[PDB]
């Protein structure tokens, strides 16, 4: 019931490298999950323009932002097209991308981690702040699927039980120990002004009673 994938071998390389290099401004992980998720909504407004029932899974287009001190999760959700079994395994670890090594050619001549998102592989700047990423999705052609990895050269994908999304992908970070300050609201207001300004859907930060 638990199916277990190598990654790609340029794409295990590409999250060795972010996970090891010393890069100070890890932020920019929000605005390329956030960029992803506008994606994916714009992708599901334009199939919708000529067959209106694929949103009978839901109408609204949006993306939360969830922190959960308790747990130490920073979870990113959205309602755009999400993804099938297939795109999940294909799009996210197992095939090449002509970007992962453009990208890494890339910083070899001394571009900047924060350029990931022009090689298509912004995903993996999670692994900045996380030491673990769930990604839950679900498709209109298919079942909700949980794809999970911490890196380590492998990621898991299974049939998911958890509260049904309707569709859509949402993006669970299990954050490292000394990465925290990305679960304080005054913080992650401040990325998303910085980066996410323009983005054509509404972003809802939500907060948390204290302890
Ligand atoms: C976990 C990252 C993530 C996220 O944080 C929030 C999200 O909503 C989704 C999505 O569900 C999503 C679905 C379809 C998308 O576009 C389909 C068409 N395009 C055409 C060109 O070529 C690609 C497909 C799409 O665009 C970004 C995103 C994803 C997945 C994702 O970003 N992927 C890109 C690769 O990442 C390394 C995987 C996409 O597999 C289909």
Redesign the pocket.
């Given at each position: 019931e638990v199916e277990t994938f190598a990654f790609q071998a340029e794409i295990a390389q590409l999250m060795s490298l972010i996970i090891n290099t010393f890069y100070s401004n890890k932020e920019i992980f929000l605005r390329?999950?956030?960029?992803?998720?506008?994606?994916?909504?714009?992708?599901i407004r334009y199939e919708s323009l000529t067959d209106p029932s694929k949103l009978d899974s839901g109408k609204e287009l949006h993306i939360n932002l969830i922190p959960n001190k308790q747990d130490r999760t920073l979870t990113?959700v959205?309602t755009?097209?999400?993804?099938?079994k297939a795109?999940?395994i294909?799009?996210?670890?197992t095939i090449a991308?002509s970007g992962t090594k453009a990208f890494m050619e890339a910083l070899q001549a001394g571009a900047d981690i924060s350029m990931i998102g022009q090689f298509?592989?912004?995903?993996?700047s999670?692994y900045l702040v996380a030491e673990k990423?769930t990604?839950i999705?679900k498709?209109n052609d298919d079942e909700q699927y949980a794809?999970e990895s911490s890196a380590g050269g492998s990621f898991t994908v299974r049939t998911d039980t958890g509260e049904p999304m309707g569709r859509?992908?949402k993006?669970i970070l299990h954050l490292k120990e000394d990465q925290t300050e990305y679960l304080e609201e005054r913080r992650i207001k401040e990325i998303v002004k910085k980066h996410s300004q323009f983005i054509g859907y509404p972003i809802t930060l939500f907060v948390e009673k204290e302890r």
């Open positions: 390329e999950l956030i960029s992803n998720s506008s994606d994916a909504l714009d992708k990113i959205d755009g097209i999400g993804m099938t795109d999940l294909n799009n996210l670890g991308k298509g592989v912004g995903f993996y999670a990423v990604v999705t498709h794809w859509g992908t993006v």
